[PDB]
Amino acid sequence: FESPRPYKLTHQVVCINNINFQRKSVVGFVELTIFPTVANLNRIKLNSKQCRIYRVRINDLEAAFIYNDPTLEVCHSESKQRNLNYFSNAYAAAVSAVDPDAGNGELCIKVPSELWKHVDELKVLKIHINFSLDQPKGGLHFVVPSVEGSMAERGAHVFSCGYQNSTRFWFPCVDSYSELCTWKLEFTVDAAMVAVSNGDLVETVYTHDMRKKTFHYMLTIPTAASNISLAIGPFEILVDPYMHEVTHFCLPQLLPLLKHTTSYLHEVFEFYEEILTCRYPYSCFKTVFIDEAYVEVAAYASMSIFSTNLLHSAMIIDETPLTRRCLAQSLAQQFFGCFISRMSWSDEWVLKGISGYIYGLWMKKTFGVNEYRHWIKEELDKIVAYELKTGGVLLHPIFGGGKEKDNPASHLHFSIKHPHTLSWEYYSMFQCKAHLVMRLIENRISMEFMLQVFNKLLSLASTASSQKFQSHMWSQMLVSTSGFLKSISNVSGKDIQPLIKQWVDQSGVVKFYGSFAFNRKRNVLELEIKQDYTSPGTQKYVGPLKVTVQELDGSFNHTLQIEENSLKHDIPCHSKSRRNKKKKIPLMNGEEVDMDLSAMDADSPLLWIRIDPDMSVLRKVEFEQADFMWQYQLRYERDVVAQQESILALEKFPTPASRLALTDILEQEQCFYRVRMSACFCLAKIANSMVSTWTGPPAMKSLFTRMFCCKSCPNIVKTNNFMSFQSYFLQKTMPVAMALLRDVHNLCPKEVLTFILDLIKYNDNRKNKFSDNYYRAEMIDALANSVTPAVSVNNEVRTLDNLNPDVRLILEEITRFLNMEKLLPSYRHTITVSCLRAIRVLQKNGHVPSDPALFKSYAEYGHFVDIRIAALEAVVDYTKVDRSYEELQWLLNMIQNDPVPYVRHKILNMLTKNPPFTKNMESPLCNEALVDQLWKLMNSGTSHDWRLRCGAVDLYFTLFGLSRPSCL
Amino acid sequence: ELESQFILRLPPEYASTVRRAVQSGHVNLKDRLTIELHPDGRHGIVRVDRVPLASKLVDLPCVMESLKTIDKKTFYKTADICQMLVSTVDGDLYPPKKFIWNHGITLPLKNVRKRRFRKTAKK
Amino acid sequence: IIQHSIPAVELRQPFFPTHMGPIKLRQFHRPPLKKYSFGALSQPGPHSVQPLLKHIKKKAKMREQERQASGGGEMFFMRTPQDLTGKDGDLILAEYSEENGPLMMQVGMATKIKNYYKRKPGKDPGAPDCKYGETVYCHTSPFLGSLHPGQLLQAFENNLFRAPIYLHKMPETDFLIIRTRQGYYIRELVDIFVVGQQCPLFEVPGPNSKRANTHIRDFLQVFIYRLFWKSKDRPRRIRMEDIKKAFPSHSESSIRKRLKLCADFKRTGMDSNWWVLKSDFRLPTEEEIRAMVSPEQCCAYYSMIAAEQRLKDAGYGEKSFKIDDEVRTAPWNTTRAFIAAMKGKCLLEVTGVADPTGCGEGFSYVKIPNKDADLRRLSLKNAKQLLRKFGVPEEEIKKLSRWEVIDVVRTMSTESVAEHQERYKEECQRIFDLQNKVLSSTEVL
């Protein structure tokens, strides 16, 4: 109910002063107003790192000072137990001891006996701490362009990105969540550079009248400490006119990009207050764009600060989803970092659950309900893929208290009480399972009842906030899992605790071997299907559910399920649909018009099998039908889920020409965008099986012929095929699938190669007002998908033939596009990213030799994030395939030494995803000194961020995981 | 067990007195209004301020439902009512087909048994 | 969305009776005042009739405080049998104009009031406000007749039936008496509704039909499961005698069918033996039992067996249910007629024998289906003179294409499937408007 934490807190005043750009330091004093709880509270603990305190003071009395860092290395630096398990357990216990959720110590000021007698008299105190941040090595960021003479004034900015508990790294506090406080914030800033944090503009004139300004932001609204961040430097734009109080802060020469970017946000506010039945529960809302991003999502109190990658300036069409997608994320996680709050790390999952569900509801009534279901399919793809890679993602209410583990989910790391042990794969699937558990709450409880629940939560939050700090009656904003469950059961009490003990408290992905049997094939038994499941390693036995069957022309049959899963079950049978030449359309689904006796329609009243088409269960369903039923699903079905799962099932085995015909019929209608992308991939995989069975034409030429008429297109489609984004996505996708069309003689895509060359010839001027960039990028990706691995028979790598014959033309085109984007550049060098992927594929086919020096020169510092991340993916795969130890040493040294966090994040991420030095396959000899240097990089040099040593924990998961590394 | 509810009808002066007592909410109404039922189950005595009124239990023709509410939109049915205890100022207090009431309580439902009820055809 | 009370959803007794005798079926929804064998009111003499005013205010305060403490909005209060009492909360009376409705709610079930209003043409300022119900603006009429512009019509709404309701005043002589074992209770009540003919939304089964026989089996399966949940022994066990006492019309062999899959018989040396729950049988949870049988399904069965008793009392044997007039008035006949007519499968008799009012003020729910020589010898000129005689306008006389002239004079001498449905709508509209006028009138007869 209540927090197990003494020393309640009310007020805190920050005052940043003397912020430097040359020695790059910060000095400041912080002010805490504290009501202690119990007597003999002598060793009062706060917590921070990289903070040299100048002095501490309580009412003109400098007391004692304790400053420890057990977040650093093991207490013996040469602890020979250099394995995963001992380091994981010792680090979990050590950083739990860093956490003040016990009698612990990181910053323990000792109360003297005089002030102890004062605590015996009055438990009301004030804390004044003068301190100084150095050159910030994990707590702030000083983005400075390398000029330093004049453009350090105009062109640089100062901010703080970080994780949830990164407030420790910036200014000293408690465990930085779950301390409902109020703040006064004093900012010694430049006259041009504007400081952006929480609260309100409560005292701002040209302040202190000497040379600079000083900002007073007061946060009276009670939040936690894990919401404060200070962006200094950008320029003010009000993009108000619809709701009059939305403020934005961005760097100069980026301002009409904001004038296009911000709008449609008022619609998101309108829909969120249709959901919540309130107002926006603040004064105003702030947004800062910045050329760095620890997290792309990041959402704080009345303020969203994230990357200058999401502008999307009116011509750059393929961020039409992404921009307001990330804005919806940075409003939802905003709303649930503001008021509703966890009591512990194990109690969080409700928050990001309801936030992801709220921006999913936003994705419902803004764009693409079928794309919304496709996003749910991508969520299931992510969850099934990761929890078949690794174990489950469990949502604990249960602790390991009493030095206990209780962790079957400890295949790698600790998960119960602590954030900074987890991986971003685990964190992403935490959010993904939060999405789908909220969809299970949809599946058992009505949406209107959820609106009632959420209105009750925000009613208790807004009533408990903005008051005179009611003593002992103020922690109602801690709305964690237990009381939230009680509120749901008060609204509608059902079997939601079985839903918890299934999906919240048993982290398992469930496959489904629902074996199709065929009764009423003029049979004695009537329409029966067997249920079966067993697949251990990561399995789960889920019982009572329902099953959806569509008839030929008839009812949605729904059938119960049972536990003890060696089962046989029935169907609420259709009539005997006989004389079906007369029974043409007896109401299939409304007024849909379809006629085929082409199936096995002698004695078959069934068409399709389905288990929960609204996608309740974390599922991977495996079964078999007749192939005619699968192909008849792809002429029309009212589920994009059914369409793309039949697309996968018909990507596996078949090759008739009627499949190609029905695929081309499905691709020429108004059905869906990405269904046709994966259907062109069906055409690719099936025409790859047309080596000896080349019955049709060379495919997908007639699809460009019969669908696109500019001026009737005399054999060639050239100009101005836009303003219909169906054709935009389709022309973006299809030549990539055309480049896969291969029959095995030399795989011979020569007509397709020349056709793609002719398409690259025929680009448009400014008649298209749509910045023809991604079309070029995916055609270069089709050139990358022109993999020809079998040219170098003996030695043709090293400028022998000036290698021949079409590879040289592809080199000409990628040279042209690289130098055009060196001269033109149009939007982020995305063409250069596709070209570098093409150059790596050519290095993987032995045409351009395996040399990292181009990728080395594009992994340098002063480039864009995407260029650098593509070159780093390239050099990670280079270290995987080739035996380059020296570039791995440089890669680890740049993991140690660079100021950008996200490139380190993604180096570690896709170094874990694409590993060299593979466990129990050790030919390049990691045992020599690489185990030692990786152990050092886990211990030392990684006190900057938590996630970098989390990625290093992922590295030792991949590299020599549950054993000694076979050194000694 | 199911709660039993029935309609109590009084003479208008006694109905006004008991109505003022109910609207006042004083406890002593439990002394001001008493009901005694005879062993035949059809006759009774209703005492208002110790004044006896001869009462007759009659069967209402229309089925009546009494329903409770909180928000005045969704209603929860509480009881079925089909009987009415009618008090008169005259009549035998101890009396030594005639208990069939012919009318609705509401104004349009007058003479429902003779005019607004379809009669069953036998055989 | 109708949310019934928790004792209603949990299929609890005596709110949902398990068996009703011939006396109980005649007394269905008309419970006679019955003497107690023990308690305060089992004693002779006068008994105190106690006020409720302090109790009403206290309960309304507490329920409002429970609403504001978590922390507002909509809260569900009907969780216990004590919450379903008439001692607290705001109450109405509802007097059904039908003697025996095709569907009836039990004690504990829920219903809504929707205030159906048709907008005036042009600038409507909105519907008038009512004391009860939620305003619903409708363009298509939910009843058999159409609303007029500016007409407000109140109605009961649930999963069983639709029926218009009419707010009247309770007479000044009439009070509500709540009678329990412990004492007599009295409350003032002024608002009483007259409820018209029902528009049934749920199908009433026929006697010994497959749906009816499935319902009795499932309700027996629900009652058996909740007996296991009531048993405190480990392993759980019940007696055959407890089921037979609740189900005296079932043979023991039919109860042996429902008990063989879930229980094992352990015989003991006494004429009282136990059915012990199987160790490998998982007893179904509460909400799984809730999905097996709904409160609406019980009322459809309850309506059937009560009406079947009334037909047996009227001399009609089981071979009668080509069909007799009174058998047409059965709820399995009226509801199947209405719902098929609601789905557009057929039309209604409306003026006919199944009129529950018997005087032309209600609807009869019985199915009805959805179903030149000499003029051409007139020799144009005389047809022209005939069109002049009938009063046909001079344009048609003037054009004088002879085929058109003869078709027009045949039409005028006539002056069929669009008239058939229009006459249905006219007959529906007339009685609907007549029913609106009579049951809302405050005329003293």
Side-chain angles (χ1 to χ4, degrees), chain A residues 446 448-449 452 455-457 459-460 463 476 487 490-495 498 544 562-564, chain C residues 1 3 6 66-76 79 280-282 285-288 290:
Chain A
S446 177
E448 293 179 353
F449 289 161
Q452 293 175 357
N455 196 2
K456 284 183 176 182
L457 300 184
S459 69
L460 287 169
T463 303
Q476 293 180 356
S487 178
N490 287 317
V491 172
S492 179
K494 292 178 180 179
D495 286 331
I562 311 171
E563 280 285 333
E564 295 177 354
Chain C
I1 302 299
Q3 183 177 2
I6 299 298
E66 187 178 1
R67 184 180 295 170
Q68 294 294 321
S70 296
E74 183 178 1
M75 186 65 206
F76 182 75
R79 65 179 68 88
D280 56 354
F281 181 76
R282 183 179 65 86
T285 61
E286 177 65 33
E287 280 79 6
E288 290 180 350
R290 290 174 177 178

Side-chain angles (χ1 to χ4, degrees), chain A residues 475-514:
Chain A
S475 67
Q476 293 180 356
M477 298 177 74
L478 294 172
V479 199
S480 67
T481 303
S482 66
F484 176 67
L485 180 62
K486 291 179 182 179
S487 178
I488 295 174
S489 295
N490 287 317
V491 172
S492 179
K494 292 178 180 179
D495 286 331
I496 53 175
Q497 292 180 356
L499 186 64
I500 288 173
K501 290 183 180 180
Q502 285 181 356
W503 299 101
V504 175
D505 294 341
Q506 184 66 41
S507 63
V509 167
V510 185
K511 293 181 180 180
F512 285 97
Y513 289 165

Side-chain angles (χ1 to χ4, degrees), chain A residues 535-638:
Chain A
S535 69
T538 303
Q539 67 180 358
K540 181 173 178 176
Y541 290 163
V542 177
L545 299 167
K546 292 180 77 68
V547 177
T548 301
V549 176
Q550 294 190 1
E551 300 169 354
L552 288 175
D553 295 323
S555 67
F556 288 165
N557 292 321
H558 296 286
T559 303
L560 294 173
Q561 297 186 0
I562 311 171
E563 280 285 333
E564 295 177 354
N565 291 318
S566 67
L567 293 171
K568 298 177 184 179
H569 289 283
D570 296 331
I571 291 168
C573 295
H574 188 62
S575 62
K576 284 187 185 177
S577 65
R578 299 293 181 186
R579 299 292 184 269
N580 288 317
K581 293 180 182 179
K582 292 182 181 180
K583 290 183 180 180
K584 294 181 181 179
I585 303 167
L587 202 147
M588 49 184 73
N589 282 316
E591 292 180 352
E592 293 175 358
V593 177
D594 277 325
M595 287 179 70
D596 275 331
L597 293 174
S598 65
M600 295 176 71
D601 291 331
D603 293 327
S604 67
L606 296 175
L607 281 181
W608 303 290
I609 310 165
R610 183 60 62 195
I611 297 170
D612 289 331
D614 290 331
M615 304 176 78
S616 69
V617 170
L618 301 176
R619 65 181 181 178
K620 186 176 179 181
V621 183
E622 294 291 328
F623 63 96
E624 291 180 353
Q625 297 176 356
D627 306 339
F628 294 153
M629 300 160 75
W630 291 101
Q631 294 179 357
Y632 191 72
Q633 205 164 11
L634 290 177
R635 189 170 71 185
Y636 186 76
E637 180 65 27
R638 290 183 178 179

Side-chain angles (χ1 to χ4, degrees), chain B residues 68 77 80 110 116 118, chain C residues 29 83 105 326 361 445:
Chain B
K68 70 186 290 182
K77 174 177 172 180
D80 281 324
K110 191 70 174 290
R116 198 179 169 86
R118 182 186 62 82
Chain C
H29 289 290
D83 288 328
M105 293 183 287
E326 184 66 32
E361 297 179 353
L445 292 173

Side-chain angles (χ1 to χ4, degrees), chain B residues 1 3-4 8-10 19 23 61 63 65 67-69 72-77 80 110 116 118, chain C residues 29 83 85 88 90 92 94 96 105 108 111-113 133 172-175 179 188 326 361 445:
Chain B
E1 63 183 1
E3 295 178 353
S4 179
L8 181 63
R9 179 173 288 172
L10 293 175
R19 182 175 292 275
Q23 290 181 356
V63 53
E65 293 183 353
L67 290 80
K68 70 186 290 182
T69 189
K72 293 182 175 68
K73 292 180 176 66
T74 301
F75 289 6
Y76 293 96
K77 174 177 172 180
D80 281 324
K110 191 70 174 290
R116 198 179 169 86
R118 182 186 62 82
Chain C
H29 289 290
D83 288 328
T85 192
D88 52 355
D90 295 331
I92 70 159
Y96 289 169
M105 293 183 287
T111 187
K112 292 182 182 292
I113 298 174
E172 296 292 327
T173 62
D174 291 332
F175 287 152
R179 182 251 178 83
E188 185 188 5
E326 184 66 32
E361 297 179 353
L445 292 173

Side-chain angles (χ1 to χ4, degrees), chain A residues 48-171:
Chain A
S48 67
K49 288 181 69 177
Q50 294 177 356
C51 296
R52 181 179 176 180
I53 310 298
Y54 282 166
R55 66 101 177 267
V56 191
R57 186 177 65 86
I58 296 172
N59 293 318
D60 291 330
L61 293 174
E62 183 179 2
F65 179 74
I66 296 170
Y67 182 76
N68 292 318
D69 285 327
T71 313
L72 293 175
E73 300 181 355
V74 185
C75 295
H76 191 273
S77 66
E78 292 181 353
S79 66
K80 292 182 181 180
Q81 294 178 357
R82 293 180 181 176
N83 293 319
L84 180 62
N85 292 319
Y86 177 73
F87 181 76
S88 66
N89 291 318
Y91 182 78
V95 185
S96 70
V98 173
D99 295 332
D101 293 332
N104 291 320
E106 298 296 322
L107 292 172
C108 284
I109 175 171
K110 288 183 179 180
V111 171
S113 67
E114 295 177 353
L115 292 175
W116 180 68
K117 290 181 181 179
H118 285 290
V119 169
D120 291 331
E121 290 179 353
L122 293 174
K123 293 179 181 178
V124 174
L125 291 174
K126 293 180 181 180
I127 295 170
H128 175 78
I129 297 170
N130 193 1
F131 61 94
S132 65
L133 291 170
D134 293 330
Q135 289 182 356
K137 296 179 178 66
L140 288 167
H141 298 287
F142 295 165
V143 171
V144 175
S146 66
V147 174
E148 294 179 354
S150 66
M151 295 179 73
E153 294 178 353
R154 293 180 181 177
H157 61 277
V158 168
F159 65 99
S160 64
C161 286
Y163 196 72
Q164 297 181 359
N165 289 319
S166 66
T167 308
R168 297 178 184 177
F169 290 162
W170 177 45
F171 73 108

